[PDB]
Design a protein around this ligand. Sequence first.
Ligand SMILES: *[C@@H]1O[C@H](CO)[C@@H](O[C@@H]2O[C@H](CO)[C@@H](O[C@@H]3O[C@H](CO)[C@@H](O)[C@H](O)[C@@H]3O)[C@H](O)[C@H]2NC(C)=O)[C@H](O)[C@H]1NC(C)=O
Ligand SMILES: *[C@@H]1O[C@H](CO)[C@@H](O[C@@H]2O[C@H](CO)[C@@H](O)[C@H](O)[C@H]2NC(C)=O)[C@H](O)[C@H]1NC(C)=O
Ligand SMILES: *[C@@H]1O[C@H](CO)[C@@H](O)[C@H](O)[C@H]1NC(C)=O
Ligand SMILES: *[C@@H]1O[C@H](CO)[C@@H](O)[C@H](O)[C@H]1NC(C)=O
Lengths: 46, 46, 50
Amino acid sequence: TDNTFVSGNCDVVIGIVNNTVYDPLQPELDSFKEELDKYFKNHTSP
Amino acid sequence: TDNTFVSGNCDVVIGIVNNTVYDPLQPELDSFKEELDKYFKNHTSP
Amino acid sequence: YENQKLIANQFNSAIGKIQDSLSSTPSALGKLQDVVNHNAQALNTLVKQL
Ligand SMILES: *[C@@H]1O[C@H](CO)[C@@H](O[C@@H]2O[C@H](CO)[C@@H](O[C@@H]3O[C@H](CO)[C@@H](O)[C@H](O)[C@@H]3O)[C@H](O)[C@H]2NC(C)=O)[C@H](O)[C@H]1NC(C)=O
Ligand SMILES: *[C@@H]1O[C@H](CO)[C@@H](O[C@@H]2O[C@H](CO)[C@@H](O)[C@H](O)[C@H]2NC(C)=O)[C@H](O)[C@H]1NC(C)=O
Ligand SMILES: *[C@@H]1O[C@H](CO)[C@@H](O)[C@H](O)[C@H]1NC(C)=O
Ligand SMILES: *[C@@H]1O[C@H](CO)[C@@H](O)[C@H](O)[C@H]1NC(C)=O
């Protein structure tokens, strides 16, 4: 995301291809927001 | 870490020094981890 | 920085060829050779008309 900027939808550009954009916020979240789900099972599951 | 950009390991630059890069997303998150761990302590309190 | 040993080695190799190529081609300094050739020869034909 730090290398790319967006402008509008993706149908007007001629020759645009399909690929994902690696959002760097997600590894900082999926290693920590998913860690909350394990802490949710600390009291709910037993 | 938004003022700087990274490239590879630090074993190739001649004259590189040691310092700490202040990530700005962490202390907003880590203070929220303190509230979440307090909430998780509140989750496991009863 | 990741290539300074290569860049510093390549620059000194390129600057070493300037010392050889300047004393190889004879007309390299032809830009300065004809500014003194034209002035001396026009001086020569000035006194040749006496
Ligand atoms: C990049 O991926 C997108 C997926 O989001 C591709 O869009 C897909 O394009 C096809 C074109 O044939 C769509 O099929 C058609 O859908 C319409 C309804 O919108 C339907 O009436 C037709 O019978 C036909 O099935 C497909 O639905 C659409 N995908 C989605 C999720 O809407 C796009 O083509 C890809 N581009 C490249 C360059 O690979
Ligand atoms: C910057 O910190 C790193 C991390 O400790 C230093 O790297 C180590 O330096 C010691 C020397 O005291 C070596 O014995 C280790 O093998 C080094 N480890 C690695 C992974 O390289 C580094 O020397 C420090 N930089 C400076 C200029 O002191
Ligand atoms: C490139 O030009 C050829 C010939 O006109 C065409 O078939 C092809 O689709 C073009 N490529 C793109 C990405 O438009
Ligand atoms: C559950 O919470 C207790 C204290 O609230 C903590 O000591 C324990 O490590 C937690 N369980 C896990 C799997 O982290």
